[PDB]
């Protein structure tokens with residue numbers, strides 16, 4: 170128990186790791202998104218960062234995943250987007266490769282999530298009406 | 300099935316529609332609230348917009364309606380605010396007309412919502428204490 | 430059968446190439462550290478394993494940002510200083526011939542003139558020693574800049590010494606550093622780390638030679654955007670430094686002349702003792718060994734039986750035709766002709782002395798209409814520096830001949846910054862991700 | 871025709887036409903310009 174070292178994966182350390190292993194350290198990435206002429210540029214950069222953070226949070230809230238890092242949904246996975254099974258995704262791939270593969274099927278999923286969440290909200294209101 | 304146009308109600312397109320119909324497109328409006336001397340004014344405008352958005356989100360959160368677009372509450376509807384029935388509100392009126400009508404009974408409703416949510420939180424804590 | 434559903438993750442380790450504005454970090458100077466943040470005493474580096482990135486030193490925006498920031502700082506430093514508007518007068522000059530050698534004949538002019546005083550109804554008669562490069566004949570002369578623009582005098586308290594500067598990125602961005610040795614600035618880097626910000630970079634201004642820089646850890650490195658094209662400069666990074674000793678030996682004197690209410694002009698009074706040329710020294714054996722290494726590395730790209738020649742500069746302005754630098758406030762322009770003069774064929778204590786000149790009216794950056802008058806420095810001056818690289822250009826290059834001739838180059842200061850920021854790049858994080866998963870809300 | 875208060879004579883009247891009316895005008899003198907250096911990097915342009 171003496172002569173042993175302890176090291177933790179820091180910030181982007183899990184970039185090269187698989188998706189399943191990289192999904193266990195989302196908090197370290199999440200915490201780092203927030204934190205005369207030159208002052209103008211610095212303040213513009215700060216405002217842009219704040220705006221990007223607020224945009225991402227607004228999208229998450231609109232999809233109904235507010236306040237969650239992992240939030241599984243009701244939208245089924247169309248096979249046209251991808252054909253690979255879970256064995257070859259969560260244990261034989263990384264997030265960068267997945268982003269490169271799926272970069273052209275992103276907006277339609279967002280619209281589907283928005284419409285689905287609107288439908289769930291309407292149904293919840295109707296249920297609570299009774 | 301050829302020679303047919305598809306047009307979607309855009310941004311404030313539902314401004315003239317009834318309340319019930321206008322309540323089906325809240326997301327398009329919600330998404331649009333966020334997005335040397337002249338740079339100062341532009342940055343001031345951006346900061347003011349961000350502050351307004353954060354104020355509205357805080358007001359929503361304090362009432363227990365965080366992360367929801369249609370959130371129902373527990374406060375009963377005092378008849379002194381408006382005597383009209385649901386038939387003559389949600390099918391024969393518009394949001395602008397309703398805002399003009401109830402523009403003088405707004406703050407008291409906010410205070411009632413705040414106190415009700417505080418009482419609900421206290422009761423939930425007491426329930427969980429057991 | 431798949432029954433998979435979209436699931437959202439926030440905080441995924443994904444990034445994209447992006448451009449932003451970095452800010453200071455540093456531990457009276459022209460490079461003002463007052464408006465620059467303090468640096469962390471213990472910088473942190475995170476080595477990313479299995480991450481191979483793409484790098485291109487010739488498309489880095491950090492170089493442009495550094496150039497703009499350096500120019501802005503230089504402009505800012507000169508604002509609260511005296512403007513030498515009244516100095517455009519008719520000077521009457523005479524040759525200086527007191528204890529001069531055979532190579533300093535005609536370089537110095539003893540010029541008398543009339544000047545204003547604190548009271549606007551009085552005049553005084555004064556004299557000063559000017560350099561031949563500063564005065565143009567109109568026995569009557571005028572300053573070289575008088576028909577272009579009036580221009581200011583550097584305040585005598587600010588120091589020109591470079592200070593290290595670190596560049597740290599904003600929130601939501603990251604700086605990736607390529608730790609792969611032998612990396613020639615373009616292509617894939619298997620070995621990468623993440624840094625909060627870069628090592629201290631001294632903004633050293635020089636031409637034809639890179640001074641007080643960083644050294645390759647393994648061997649001499651040759652870099653070029655397109656080595657087949659002769660219109661692109663070649664950056665050579667040495668493995669070991671070559672010491673160079675420069676000196677101005679004249680015992681100068683400084684005097685102050687009051688040209689108005691709270692405004693002084695610093696003139697060269699007289700020279701004590703003998704008058705001799707300023708010069709630089711570089712060791713001969715070390716230079717020969719360095720050139721041997723350089724030609725050995727050059728043979729890799731230009732054939733194994735090719736004859737490699739080093740020749741003189743082509744021509745142009747004095748700034749680009751000579752190794753120009755600043756040694757303790759005095760601006761030297763020196764003739765690097767004994768260095769790049771030799772031919773190489775495939776198969777003790779003396780030193781090379783470069784004699785060279787000094788100037789006082791300076792157009793630092795490639796601009797017209799703004800000078801900078803350098804006040805004289807009092808006494809003898811000497812300095813020593815490390816040569817750690819070269820900027821070369823290949824002349825001609827046609828297939829007719831099998832001899833390759835390389836000549837010194839320079840002028841553009843972006844090449845000086847490029848040699849330091851070659852292994853860094855900036856990216857922006859993309860924390861939103863979507864994957865298949867077997868729940869359902 | 872637009873006016874804030876057409877009864878009040880102190881308010882201007884804005885008239886907007888339905889079609890445009892073309893107007894052509896010229897200075898026909900063949901002028902000449904010369905430069906006079908009044909200082910270091912300062913020129914004054916005069917009619918020669």
Ligand SMILES: *[C@@H]1O[C@H](CO)[C@@H](O[C@@H]2O[C@H](CO)[C@@H](O[C@@H]3O[C@H](CO)[C@@H](O)[C@H](O[C@H]4O[C@H](CO)[C@@H](O)[C@H](O)[C@@H]4O[C@H]4O[C@H](CO)[C@@H](O)[C@H](O)[C@@H]4O)[C@@H]3O)[C@H](O)[C@H]2NC(C)=O)[C@H](O)[C@H]1NC(C)=O
Nearest residue numbers: 588590633640641754755756757806807808812813814815
């Ligand atoms: C590459 O790096 C090397 C070293 O890393 C550089 O060489 C060093 O250069 C500096 C600056 O020239 C030099 O420090 C000077 O040493 C002089 C001799 O000891 C000092 O006299 C001088 O102090 C004066 O200047 C300061 C501002 O720089 C003032 O703050 C100070 O008060 C002094 O000024 C007084 O004296 C002058 C002259 O009499 C007078 O006019 C003033 O009014 C005032 O009264 C500096 O401390 C180092 O000694 C050098 N190092 C070595 C080993 O020689 C080299 O320059 C770099 N190369 C390039 C290209 O930048």
Ligand SMILES: *[C@@H]1O[C@H](CO)[C@@H](O[C@@H]2O[C@H](CO)[C@@H](O[C@@H]3O[C@H](CO)[C@@H](O)[C@H](O)[C@@H]3O)[C@H](O)[C@H]2NC(C)=O)[C@H](O)[C@H]1NC(C)=O
Nearest residue numbers: 178182183184185186187188190191260476477478479480
């Ligand atoms: C960088 O990539 C390398 C491989 O390219 C990663 O090493 C690999 O790590 C996995 C899991 O840690 C190893 O899988 C293991 O295999 C053994 C034998 O099949 C099995 O018994 C275990 O249960 C596990 O599945 C894999 O063997 C190993 N590869 C090699 C060549 O050793 C490395 O982890 C990556 N870096 C980071 C930071 O993730």
Ligand SMILES: *[C@@H]1O[C@H](CO)[C@@H](O[C@@H]2O[C@H](CO)[C@@H](O[C@@H]3O[C@H](CO)[C@@H](O)[C@H](O)[C@@H]3O)[C@H](O)[C@H]2NC(C)=O)[C@H](O)[C@H]1NC(C)=O
Nearest residue numbers: 308309311312313314315316317318320321390391392393
């Ligand atoms: C702008 O206003 C007009 C009317 O003020 C809207 O048109 C109205 O639309 C409603 C529903 O779309 C129609 O209701 C219909 O009423 C008849 C009555 O017999 C009923 O049989 C139908 O089943 C239906 O409920 C209403 O008639 C119609 N008004 C007119 C004059 O035709 C219009 O929709 C508004 N614009 C927008 C963008 O909302």
Ligand SMILES: *[C@@H]1O[C@H](CO)[C@@H](O[C@@H]2O[C@H](CO)[C@@H](O)[C@H](O)[C@H]2NC(C)=O)[C@H](O)[C@H]1NC(C)=O
Nearest residue numbers: 524525526527539540541556557558698699700
């Ligand atoms: C530059 O010229 C001035 C003026 O001719 C010289 O100053 C004179 O020096 C002599 C002695 O050498 C004195 O007797 C005079 O009184 C000085 N004149 C003034 C106006 O002070 C000066 O010595 C010359 N400098 C050099 C380097 O030749």
Ligand SMILES: *[C@@H]1O[C@H](CO)[C@@H](O[C@@H]2O[C@H](CO)[C@@H](O)[C@H](O)[C@H]2NC(C)=O)[C@H](O)[C@H]1NC(C)=O
Nearest residue numbers: 519520521522540541542543544552553554555
């Ligand atoms: C400084 O000004 C004086 C006069 O204010 C100059 O002396 C005159 O020089 C001109 C020649 O250009 C003669 O025609 C005058 O007769 C002189 N007047 C006097 C009173 O001496 C003097 O030359 C100026 N100094 C310099 C260095 O130009």
Ligand SMILES: *[C@@H]1O[C@H](CO)[C@@H](O[C@@H]2O[C@H](CO)[C@@H](O)[C@H](O)[C@H]2NC(C)=O)[C@H](O)[C@H]1NC(C)=O
Nearest residue numbers: 640641642644669670671672813814815816817
């Ligand atoms: C010229 O190069 C030599 C050798 O690289 C420098 O001496 C080194 O200075 C560093 C200071 O960071 C020390 O850590 C090394 O141990 C030194 N090496 C040797 C062999 O002495 C020298 O400082 C350089 N000169 C200048 C002006 O930069």
Ligand SMILES: *[C@@H]1O[C@H](CO)[C@@H](O[C@@H]2O[C@H](CO)[C@@H](O)[C@H](O)[C@H]2NC(C)=O)[C@H](O)[C@H]1NC(C)=O
Nearest residue numbers: 615653654655656657658659660661826827828
């Ligand atoms: C590097 O430079 C060479 C020389 O310009 C490029 O090759 C030339 O390409 C042009 C393009 O039209 C041709 O007209 C020339 O005939 C080519 N010359 C030779 C000697 O091949 C070359 O393409 C450049 N490299 C890259 C990557 O662009």
Ligand SMILES: *[C@@H]1O[C@H](CO)[C@@H](O[C@@H]2O[C@H](CO)[C@@H](O)[C@H](O)[C@H]2NC(C)=O)[C@H](O)[C@H]1NC(C)=O
Nearest residue numbers: 674675676677708709710779780781782811812
């Ligand atoms: C550059 O080299 C020359 C010799 O080539 C040096 O000149 C010698 O300088 C020393 C100084 O200590 C004198 O003692 C010698 O008498 C000089 N010899 C000759 C022939 O001039 C010169 O000092 C060197 N300069 C620098 C800055 O290193």
Ligand SMILES: *[C@@H]1O[C@H](CO)[C@@H](O[C@@H]2O[C@H](CO)[C@@H](O)[C@H](O)[C@H]2NC(C)=O)[C@H](O)[C@H]1NC(C)=O
Nearest residue numbers: 672673674675709710711712713779780781813
């Ligand atoms: C440049 O200057 C340095 C320091 O003045 C010289 O290094 C000295 O060289 C002498 C003679 O070999 C030694 O006695 C000293 O011990 C050295 N001092 C240091 C600090 O190294 C160097 O030789 C000069 N180089 C050239 C080319 O002139």
Ligand SMILES: *[C@@H]1O[C@H](CO)[C@@H](O[C@@H]2O[C@H](CO)[C@@H](O)[C@H](O)[C@H]2NC(C)=O)[C@H](O)[C@H]1NC(C)=O
Nearest residue numbers: 740741742743744745749750751764765766770
């Ligand atoms: C590089 O070397 C050549 C060859 O000596 C230099 O050309 C000389 O230029 C001077 C002008 O100052 C002439 O007087 C000589 O006659 C030229 N030499 C020959 C052999 O004709 C050239 O100037 C050198 N490069 C630089 C930048 O000075």
Ligand SMILES: *[C@@H]1O[C@H](CO)[C@@H](O[C@@H]2O[C@H](CO)[C@@H](O)[C@H](O)[C@H]2NC(C)=O)[C@H](O)[C@H]1NC(C)=O
Nearest residue numbers: 741747750751763764765766767768770783784
């Ligand atoms: C740079 O140095 C070289 C070598 O001294 C100069 O070339 C000499 O120029 C003179 C002209 O004054 C000739 O008389 C010599 O014959 C030249 N030397 C050789 C070996 O050819 C060159 O002129 C210098 N650069 C400049 C711009 O003057």
Ligand SMILES: *[C@@H]1O[C@H](CO)[C@@H](O[C@@H]2O[C@H](CO)[C@@H](O)[C@H](O)[C@H]2NC(C)=O)[C@H](O)[C@H]1NC(C)=O
Nearest residue numbers: 872873874875876877878879880881882883884
């Ligand atoms: C338009 O202008 C007329 C003329 O000023 C206004 O009528 C006048 O109102 C003042 C207000 O005290 C009276 O003193 C005048 O006697 C009135 N004159 C006439 C001729 O009626 C009229 O009020 C203005 N319109 C509006 C809408 O304010």
Ligand SMILES: *[C@@H]1O[C@H](CO)[C@@H](O[C@@H]2O[C@H](CO)[C@@H](O)[C@H](O)[C@H]2NC(C)=O)[C@H](O)[C@H]1NC(C)=O
Nearest residue numbers: 889890891892893894895896897898899900901
């Ligand atoms: C304005 O109208 C006058 C006529 O009233 C023009 O004068 C004629 O200009 C033409 C130019 O081609 C000449 O050929 C005629 O000889 C002129 N006639 C007279 C009586 O002057 C004048 O050119 C017009 N100007 C513009 C700018 O349209």
Ligand SMILES: *[C@@H]1O[C@H](CO)[C@@H](O)[C@H](O)[C@H]1NC(C)=O
Nearest residue numbers: 522523524525534535536568
């Ligand atoms: C000054 O000396 C130079 C070089 O010897 C010469 O060309 C010039 O004519 C001289 N001027 C004089 C004596 O006025």
Ligand SMILES: *[C@@H]1O[C@H](CO)[C@@H](O)[C@H](O)[C@H]1NC(C)=O
Nearest residue numbers: 565573574575576577578911
């Ligand atoms: C100033 O004079 C020099 C030499 O007389 C000349 O080369 C230069 O072109 C002149 N500048 C301008 C702006 O005319």
Ligand SMILES: *[C@@H]1O[C@H](CO)[C@@H](O)[C@H](O)[C@H]1NC(C)=O
Nearest residue numbers: 611612613614615616617654
């Ligand atoms: C050197 O640069 C060239 C430029 O095209 C590139 O192809 C090559 O891969 C680089 N060398 C290494 C070892 O990366």
